[PDB]
Design a protein around this ligand. Sequence first.
Ligand SMILES: CC(=O)N[C@@H]1[C@@H](O)[C@H](O[C@@H]2O[C@H](CO)[C@@H](O[C@@H]3O[C@H](CO)[C@@H](O[C@@H]4O[C@H](CO)[C@@H](O[C@@H]5O[C@H](CO)[C@@H](O)[C@H](O)[C@H]5NC(C)=O)[C@H](O)[C@H]4NC(C)=O)[C@H](O)[C@H]3NC(C)=O)[C@H](O)[C@H]2NC(C)=O)[C@@H](CO)O[C@H]1O
Ligand SMILES: [Mg+2]
Ligand SMILES: [Mg+2]
Length: 435
Amino acid sequence: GFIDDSTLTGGIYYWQRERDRKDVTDGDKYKTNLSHSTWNANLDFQSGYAADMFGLDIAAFTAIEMAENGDSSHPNEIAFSKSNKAYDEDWSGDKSGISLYKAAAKFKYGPVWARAGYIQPTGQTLLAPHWSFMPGTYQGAEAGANFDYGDAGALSFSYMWTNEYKAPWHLEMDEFYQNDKTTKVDYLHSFGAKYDFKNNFVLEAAFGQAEGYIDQYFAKASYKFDIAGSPLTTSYQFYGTRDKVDDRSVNDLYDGTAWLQALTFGYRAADVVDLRLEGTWVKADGQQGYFLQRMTPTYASSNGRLDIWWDNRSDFNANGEKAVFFGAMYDLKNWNLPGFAIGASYVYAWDAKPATWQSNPDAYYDKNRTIEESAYSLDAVYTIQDGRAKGTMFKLHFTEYDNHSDIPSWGGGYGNIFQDERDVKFMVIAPFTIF
Ligand SMILES: CC(=O)N[C@@H]1[C@@H](O)[C@H](O[C@@H]2O[C@H](CO)[C@@H](O[C@@H]3O[C@H](CO)[C@@H](O[C@@H]4O[C@H](CO)[C@@H](O[C@@H]5O[C@H](CO)[C@@H](O)[C@H](O)[C@H]5NC(C)=O)[C@H](O)[C@H]4NC(C)=O)[C@H](O)[C@H]3NC(C)=O)[C@H](O)[C@H]2NC(C)=O)[C@@H](CO)O[C@H]1O
Ligand SMILES: [Mg+2]
Ligand SMILES: [Mg+2]
């Protein structure tokens, strides 16, 4: 029933960050890169289905700046950028505001479903929003279907079409453009599918396009099996992208197909420590020099599905780059501290190459150089177990990041690699239900 199955939920969020980065042009001074305290709050209405076919979802969030040092850079991605539209971004500030982030009619008819309006991708395609506390928002529609074949498996597939987007730090939607920020991309769309064989084997794949510009690929195979009574989870993931501009203009991003391949292992040992072993390998020949899982190249302009996230500041996505991640998350419940967990992680990556050509090379550009990067992070988490504030979570994250070069940040033909950093994030997440 439309009314009786309605839910209204939300949260209060607090984020405080101090990040400094090495300026190898000013004597390696670790300068303030981010320093701010910011609140978010959201309210999210989800209706039931009238006649099990017709529903509505509406949700909004606010960001309130609390503190920000004058030397912190922008946008910090928790407040709103001072620039309301992504393609106007000029990196000059941040501001408070209110954004409508869901506003959609939803539909169901047998095995088919659809949503249209201000939406997040929700099916099997490779479109994705950015996530801060809240998600970004697409203007468009998605429709898909679910077919259950009992023990023989289950098939799901969906299609999404969109012509505008806003990241959670943009108050307004913008259209899509090529790398020059002026040649129009009329839409993004994507089709994908998932087959679950109900034996812990699962296959997923999707294709997407940016109109006139980019073809995007995704595939993933996952498998779980028990060792010592606990599942070892494994997956192989492939992400691919090809452009349609190979004239060596500013819009020519990739030579051939660029891709990112990954293998992941996960295992919970002694029922108390979550372990992660992951590796990635990137090919990205051409002018850009790094792999992007999104189909529009401009920062904040759209996003795409990428199931690999190591929270170690760098993306480890340069041409040629190989990288290995080890993480451990230790639940302290047997010290009688249920809800307390501490963790640590480490990344080492090598063979990172630059763009294979540059139009205005800088002093440090050398087509055949290779470099290395590494990082380690520490994590502490507490979730309130009982009472008024049950589920309220406190998190503390520290990262030390090391560029194994003295190439200045964003330079040398490594357009997505920056210099040594120290990063500390403290966040509080306080969900609530009104009904
Ligand atoms: C609530 C919660 O817990 N949320 C997490 C969420 O944090 C996770 O998402 C991750 O969020 C962080 C944000 O904190 C993301 O970090 C982004 O990552 C970007 C790349 O992935 C990185 O992009 C670079 O940003 C630069 C500006 O800051 C760009 O520089 C500009 O380049 C222009 C190019 O010419 C130039 O003209 C400008 O002059 C230059 N800027 C200047 C001069 O100031 C640069 O181009 C850009 N690179 C790319 C490839 O776009 C961001 O800097 C970085 N920002 C931060 C941290 O502030 C991280 O990427 C997110 N995760 C991903 C990618 O997976 C989320 C993940 O699932 O989990 C949630 O739970
Ligand atoms: Mg972006
Ligand atoms: Mg260094």
